């Protein structure tokens, strides 16, 4: 609108996002997303929704604009650039601790609302100037890294998924590098069965393209791959990745784990 002034590109994929100056608050730098059906109308209902709980660890919805304008809270950083500029020999043990907790509780508010992101990765994640964590980029219908194995087989899309990616940006948040780095959803699903092993047979859901013959891998030490993690985040980070999405924990039940005591 005619308060809003874009002053950059953030990012763009699947409208796009700009770094823009609030005119009429200061000038202060927020995040304009120009979107492009009822569906469409109740998933930004959700947002305006869940904005009103004010969740410390999601972005914060300012405004959205009567093709569709979205203003939120402008974050510094991601994950990804917090990660590539933390000095060696890495990330403060107990800063993994803090933003994971952080991290956990935006996910199960979410989860709690019954919403799942379905693409959490470094690059939605924001660390605000102050060490906070915030949720972007979800409740609106590239890289397969963080990918849930029921995704990737194309048989489930609940709540687990994004355990699972949490798991995979535990792991990252010490290796300060992609886990599991694949090239394709089968590729992908290859390197990870390559890690924690080929689950059991009743485990492999039923009736995708993709048949539990069509690999071949025992369950690997995970320290080996993950250097300093401790005993119970190593338990923690397992009980994330677990292949079976009924298995896998839940950010509530993770809220509560030793790991965080
Ligand atoms: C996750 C991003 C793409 C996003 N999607 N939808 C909304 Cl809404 C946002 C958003 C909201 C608030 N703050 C930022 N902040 C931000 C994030 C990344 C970057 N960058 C720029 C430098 N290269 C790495 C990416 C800059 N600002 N983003």
């Known amino acids: 609108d005619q308060q809003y002034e874009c002053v950059a590109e953030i990012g763009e994929g699947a409208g796009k996002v700009f770094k823009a100056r609030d005119l009429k608050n200061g000038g202060r730098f927020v995040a304009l997303k120009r979107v492009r059906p009822l569906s469409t109308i109740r998933e930004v209902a959700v947002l305006r ?9 999601v972005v914060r919805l300012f405004d959205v604009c009567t093709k569709l304008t979205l203003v939120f809270e402008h974050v510094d950083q991601d994950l990804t650039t917090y990660l590539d500029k933390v000095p060696e020999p890495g990330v403060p043990t107990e800063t993994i601790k803090d933003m994971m907790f952080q991290l956990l509780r935006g996910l199960d508010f979410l989860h709690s609302h019954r919403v799942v992101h379905r693409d959490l990765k470094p690059q939605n994640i924001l660390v605000t100037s102050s060490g906070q964590i915030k949720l972007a980029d979800f409740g609106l219908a590239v890289t397969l890294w963080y990918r ?8 489930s899309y609940a709540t687990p998924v994004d355990l699972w990616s949490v798991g995979c940006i535990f792991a990252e948040m010490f290796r300060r590098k992609p886990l599991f780095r694949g090239s394709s959803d089968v590729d992908q699903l290859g390197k990870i069965l390559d890690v924690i092993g080929l689950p059991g047979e009743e485990d492999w859901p039923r009736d995708v393209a993709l048949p539990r013959q069509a690999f071949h891998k025992s369950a690997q030490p995970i320290e080996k791959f993950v250097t300093d993690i401790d005993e119970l985040g190593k338990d923690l980070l397992l009980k994330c990745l677990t292949f079976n999405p009924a298995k896998r924990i839940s950010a509530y039940s993770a809220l509560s784990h030793p790991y965080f005591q």
């Open 49 to 57: 929704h869940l904005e009103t709980f004010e969740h410390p660890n």
């Open 148 to 155: 849930a194995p029921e995704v990737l087989l194309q048989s």
